[PDB]
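re: that complex we talked abt at group meeting.

here r the seqs, copy pasted straight from the sheet so there may be weird spacing, ignore it
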Amino acid sequence: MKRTFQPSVLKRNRSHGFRARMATKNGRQVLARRRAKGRARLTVSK
Amino acid sequence: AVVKCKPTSPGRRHVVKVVNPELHKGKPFAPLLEKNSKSGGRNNNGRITTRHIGGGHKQAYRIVDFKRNKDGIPAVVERLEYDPNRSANIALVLYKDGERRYILAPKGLKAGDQIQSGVDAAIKPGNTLPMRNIPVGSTVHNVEMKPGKGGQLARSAGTYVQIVARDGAYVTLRLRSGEMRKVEADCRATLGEVGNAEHMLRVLGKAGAARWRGVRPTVRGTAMNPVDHPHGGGEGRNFGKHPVTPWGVQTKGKKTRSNKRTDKFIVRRRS
Amino acid sequence: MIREERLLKVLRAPHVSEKASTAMEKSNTIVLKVAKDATKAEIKAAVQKLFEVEVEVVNTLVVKGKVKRHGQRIGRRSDWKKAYVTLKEGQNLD
RNA sequence: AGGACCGAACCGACUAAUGAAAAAUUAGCGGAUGACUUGUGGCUGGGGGUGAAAGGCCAAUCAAACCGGGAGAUAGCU
RNA sequence: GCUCGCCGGAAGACCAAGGGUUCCUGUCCAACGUUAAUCGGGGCAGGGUGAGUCGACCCCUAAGGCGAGGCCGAAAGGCGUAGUCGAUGGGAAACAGGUUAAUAUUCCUGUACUUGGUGUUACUGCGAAGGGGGGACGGAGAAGGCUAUGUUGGCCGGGCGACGGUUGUCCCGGUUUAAGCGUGUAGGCUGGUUUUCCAGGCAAAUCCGGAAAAUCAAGGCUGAGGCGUGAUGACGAGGCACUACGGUGCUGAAGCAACAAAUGCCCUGCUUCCAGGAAAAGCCUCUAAGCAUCAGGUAACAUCAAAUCGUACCCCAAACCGACACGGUGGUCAGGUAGAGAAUACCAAGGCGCUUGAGAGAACUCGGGUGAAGGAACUAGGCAAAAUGGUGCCGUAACUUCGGGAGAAGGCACGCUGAUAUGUAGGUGAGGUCCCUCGCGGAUGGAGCUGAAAUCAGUCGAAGAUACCAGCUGGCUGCAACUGUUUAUUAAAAACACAGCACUGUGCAAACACGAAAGUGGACGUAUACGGUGUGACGCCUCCCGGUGCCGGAAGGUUAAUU
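got the structure back, here u go
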């Protein structure tokens, strides 16, 4: 059965990657939030 | 000519083809071509703005000349061509100076016919001259509404317009709709009717044919649930309401012209 | 033209392994560890100057670092650049 | 020629019996040059989308997704 | 190690995606592995991924994204021009053999190619953000020419049979060879060459386009395959020396022909249809500003250059998505016998026996086999089973929209051997002989090879479409015309859609829709069009305006802000 997650690196990066997050305001805020929390992996970026 | 196809299969039974042998069997004039990608009836927001559009065959865009400005040069018709972009047929013409253009093929036009634009041009089919030069009572097509803009009225397969009157700076046209309309007398127009008049006699004959023409199927509002359409819901088949659009506006009669800027040019509305 | 200092900083070490020994003995090819940033021409220049020996050609590759586990803690070894440097016929290297 | 026929791949899912499986199995079943199917990428965002329309689908979640917040909502009830 | 068994259009081989060391070697067996474990995709250590020509990067663009200015917007921001990104598409170049425990079109051996510089001598119009050409394109169908590949014969090597026979019309194996360079064929497309002029190609153009005129019928482009060379080479069945029993080193015959033949190539071709079928660069070409005897261009020759990143391994799976060593997953390769076949059966190459076993041979459950007599009496219901099942030929009703119905129904033949005919009809096609504008040519010729289908005669069986495979059929009737779609995971239908019909709106800055707007779709469309609603092939058809809607009217009544 085709399960929901069907990985694709490029698609992952474009969707969720660092630059994408940077591009828009809301993404930047998300980034800031994650930094505040102390996340080790700020983004999906490997 | 129209051709009723033999019923060797359902979906072929009711088919009627409109076959013109005189069209060009060959690849169109490539210089005048250009790309034309499909919308899916969706705008820049990405939302569907006009339902029932989608798919269909890849099509190129022939660059038709509706402005028709090569004044004084006589042109000769090379061939008639299938345009997927319109109900009419187009004609590839060759001006004496070596330029080629696509034009709406009028009714009587065929290969070898000579045509001409200009004030001086002769009043014969396919020739194009300002409507102050065109005699009253003539049939014309590809009519400009604004001078210099390009023909906008009467471009569809078997349309034409009647010049009923010329009163000073304006002439009054009888549009195919039956609407009588004033138009500036200096606007341009092409003599005769537009060509492919038996276009209406074709019948698709199956669902797939409609799809080929980029038309997605149509769901009736009454078949929906109320949350979707004003007509939705009802146990079994119920329709206890006045007909309306998906957006609640009355459909069977309610007029919707709101343009107060051009009211003056409409002599008489259609009926 | 490569600067001497850069040349000196290129070459990290000789690589000892069975495959390396075989390459040395048969094909007259030395296997070096080099700076990850070091390009082929650079490596060649450095070979020529610092080992005083003619080079035919350099093949390079990047070795990825192994993931290991010290006790409970996971940790990755460094990636590093390997270079097969083929030396001109009759070139004997100390 | 064909939204033509029989029929593998491929797409589906009418009957049947039966956790390896949060929808499968085997035996049969429908379509199989088209309104077909499929890979890669793209676009449409929540009272919004999309919908050959079933209130279907929108990350195992849908008569209004998920995450966080108002928030210790309110609970004549247990 | 020897037997047995399974897959073999896969359960084999190679990739993409995704994973990220799982690869190889040594070592260990606590935990992990549904048991044991000396084994492992487990632990620990070490090793392993070599590129000018493969891919990325790079040049070019699609859908789309971002977007200087700009337009719009309380703010945030939205749209969008110039631009710039964006493959899943276009754009230069490599093949064969050998080698590692583990990489290889990457190492080695041989033989190649590419496109840049730089320098040269030789020549002499070069030059773009611009013009033109090209790239550049659909579906289906039909062949013909080919090859991949396979079969047989020939040849070469080996063999003479654990049991009757087996020196022959016997048995086993092998019989392979690239890119490149030369040739330019089967075939496809097109008339060429020169001269003159011209409101066209945003300017110019010697280019393209268009007009004339002259002259010759061959000119050019394209093109699989074959042939030659590449190759006195490599590889080569197996023989022979050493042996850490893993292998290493030497050596090495023949290496031809015919037939058959793709879904691959010629073919981005041809024929045809309507639903009318990317873009841009690379590439060719034309000039402009320019420069002017310099640069630049093309000409060969020399030299330098090709960086960087990926390259292990799995990849229909125990390594990816599924919590698991548990169904899903795109591409490429496609042997033999039978067969229409990529179905099916048995096999090859190759890969496996699915990580608990041993007994026993109760009930009951599951999955199968057979069954006297009856044959739907079962049951809500013939559910399920059973049955039918192929090719050829004969034959086939109502009704029909004249196409259908129809594989209607129902029947007959079917194996093997011999003869017709020491293998026919056909297909292919060598020598020889003749012609020739000479070649991959044309005629004639028929050797050899291959080879159905039929008829007649015989013959065995209970049975000859013998296994696997492979329609059940007919009669009346509701619904829906039909092919389609649908509740992912209890509903596939009479529901939706449909072609068709009707009403209605909409004159283009269209109606309408998404958008505080700008704008966008509608549509680069224009009433033979587009939108909305209902109905729903085809045939015969299809009173009431009082109510509520809509349309038109505006005499009077009433009536806002305002005053």
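couple things i noticed - Chains A and B do not touch (no CB pair under 8 Å). The CA atoms of residues 25 and 31 of chain A lie 10 Å apart.
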